[PDB]
Each structure stands twice: as C-alpha cells, then as structure tokens.
Amino acid sequence: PTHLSVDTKFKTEGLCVDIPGIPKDMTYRRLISMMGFKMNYQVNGYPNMFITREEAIRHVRAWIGFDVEGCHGTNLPLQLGFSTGVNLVAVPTPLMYKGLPWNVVRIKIVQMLSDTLKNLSDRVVFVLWAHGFELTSMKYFVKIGPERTCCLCDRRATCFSTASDTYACWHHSIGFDYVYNPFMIDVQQWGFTGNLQSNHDLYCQVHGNAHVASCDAIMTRCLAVHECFVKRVDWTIEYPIIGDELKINAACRKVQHMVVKAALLADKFPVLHDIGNPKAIKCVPQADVEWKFYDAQPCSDKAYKIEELFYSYHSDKFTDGVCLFWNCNVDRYPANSIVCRFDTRVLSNLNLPGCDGGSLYVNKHAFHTPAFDKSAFVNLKQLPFFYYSDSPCESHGIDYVPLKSATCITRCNLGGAVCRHHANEYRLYLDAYNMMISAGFSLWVYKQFDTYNLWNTFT
C-alpha cells in the first residue's frame, strides 16, 4: 500500500451542483475516465492522477491550490485560480487576466508552475476543494502517460510540448504548452461539514474571500496545510535537500555556541534554563554554569504562553540566571533571555506560506511555525553581530588581506592587530551568521548584554 488504488471510492456529493446526476457510487478509475483521460492499463510509474494524504504530505513543496469558477461549461468562460494568486480567464471561443483561448492559457499555466516549482519540487500536486469545473477543465492543459525523463536533463518530466513532441522538467520547459503527469488531491474527501470558507475560517483570519478563484485556491491549500501540519504533526517524514539546508543548520549550531558562550562569560549567570527541544544537548559543554533542561516540542499552531511554560508549580525560579529559547516560540519572552526566533515572513525555497500568518519551514523535516510577532521581544533587544574567541593565535596548515574590525573580540585585536587564524575564523563565522540571518532566523538578547564585557576575559 504505497499509491492510491484507482478502485478506491470517491465521494461525489461536492460535484453534483456543477455535474447534476453524477453517480453516488464512483471510483477514481471512473472519475479519471469521466475527466477525459485514458490510463490504458499502464504499469509505468503513474498508477493514478490522485494521491493519498500521506503521499501529499511527503510532496508538500509541490502543492498548488487550484480552483475553477464559472464566469457565466464549454459555452461560458472559466476563471482559473491558483494559490500563487494568479487568475486566468479561459474562453471556449490577486492578479486578474482577461479572457483568452485555451491554446494560450495553457502556455501561461506551464510558465507559472515551472517558475513557482523548479526550485521546490520534481512535480506538481493540485490541491482541490472539488466541485466539478476544475476536474473537467484539466483535459484542456494536462496530458498523461508513462513516467518520462526531461529531454535536456535526468530529472522527471513535468511538461510536454505539442510543437516539438518533447518532454521537459520545470527547469527546461520554456515554450512548453502542456502540464505532464500532474498529481492531485481533493480535500473534500477527508470528511468535512460545510463549505470551504467555513472550514478554512475556523483556523485562519489572514486569507479573505474576495470571490475570485485564486482566493478559494489559497484557502484550499491553507486548510490542507492546517490539517496535515498544524493539527496533525509528523517529524519522522524526511524531505530532500533542495538548497542550503546543511550550511544553514551548521551555521545555526555555530551561532548558538558563540552567543551562549559569550553571554555566560560576559554576565556569569550561575544557572541557565534551556527551554525547548526534548532532545537538546548543552551547546556550551565546557561552561561552568548549572544547565537545566525543560522539554517543549516545536509549537505548530499558536506560540506557547509563557504563563503555561513557567507557572502552575525545575529550579522554579526562571528569574534566576538566564533562559535560553532556541527556536522555542513563546508569546512574550522574559527579560533574562537569549532567543532565536524564526521569522515566518522570510522569502526562501525552504519557507512555504502557511496557515493564519504562520509558515511551513521545510528543512529535513516540516515545521509549521506560528506567525512572527515583534511584541514577543518587548523585554529584549536585537543581538548585535560579534565574533568571540579565546583560542590561541596560531595559523596551522586561501590568500590574506589583513582584518580590521571592532567586532572581532580576540586577544590579538585587544593587543592591536588581528592574527591570520582569528581573521580566517572571523570571516567564516560572519559567513555562517549571514547565512542563518538570510534563512529567516532572528536573534534577541537581554538588554544588559554588552560585548565590552568580553575584553576582560583576556588577562
């Protein structure tokens, strides 16, 4: 049991307003045939256009919400809406395009999907709240057949061109007119009462209903993300490497060690309360401090309330020493904190739009993160960049230009001239730091933090 059986039943009640008289008894096999597609008894990697919820979750980067609204059914124009915010009008003869025939609409669909997905996924998954017109419009821009490879590379084929009779992936599809072997899932099969807007609005106030197809496409994908990543969580699902995952993760570990080590040296806290991941390890193993751990899994719905994490009777005195919240999202951080908080607004191939202002951050595992909120940090300040090292000044073992920097906190810089080793380490640390920041992470610290206190740790 890996793929969705074509003989599985499909509930058709949501389809009967656009398609009156539709049989109540229906399989995916008969639905696909009714959509104008012929599977021809083929064992060539594409057993069904539709996929399971488990397969959709594994391919969350490929999700594109899709909706079709009747403008006036082969006689009338159709408004095609996508979760990218695009609306196209197809004439049978928040971006809103005027009515055009299918032969040009399909070229725009291929360009839009290719630009959106080339750096995210090897496929497209159309996320539907199926009412009928969207299923019957697929024959006008989709072609199916055996699984194929790109004509210019080793990636799987996602597009087809009638002009050249060739196949291409999302990276090599310029000028292609058909979406090839797309996947789809109908959210209405999951068991819901009431319409799309009433189910979506139970969990999200950020997406409105301006009565255009793209608004429904956006709400559909949002509801699907809430169901699969907010109310249900699975950290055992692995996602492929598509960008700077390894560098970002290594940079995060370097920055955490640096910041925590310097905070402990500068203010000499007798105790550190490490709140977050139940699998956390001491990020500064040689620090003198009393290290105490408190378990909290990553919150995927609303940020934790500091009153619930800390109160209801542990050192109990979280006010003693310092609190470390490394990706532990809370409503309001205490004044004595060191914080790393992911900024959900960041634009990247790792960060996908999420539910109710939140974002789905996908880096090895998928983490739905509650919306970034500047008021969470009212008791803290932004942590400034700095590099600290007490390691000996010795090169060992890439040409040089001497480093001059007020933020290189080393014995050599205190003594007037940065050594080659600390200049190389400073530049590598600045690169790791910039990588973590640009990935979306933000760093905050207690207001008394001052790197001027680190210079006397060299005596």
Ligand SMILES: CN(C)c1ccc(CNn2cnnc2)cc1
């Ligand atoms: C912030 N913008 C412009 C952005 C980011 C990611 C994606 C891809 N994932 N998606 C979301 N909704 N449909 C597809 C699309 C747009």
Ligand SMILES: [Zn+2]
């Ligand atoms: Zn290719």
Ligand SMILES: [Zn+2]
């Ligand atoms: Zn929403």
Ligand SMILES: [Zn+2]
């Ligand atoms: Zn040095």
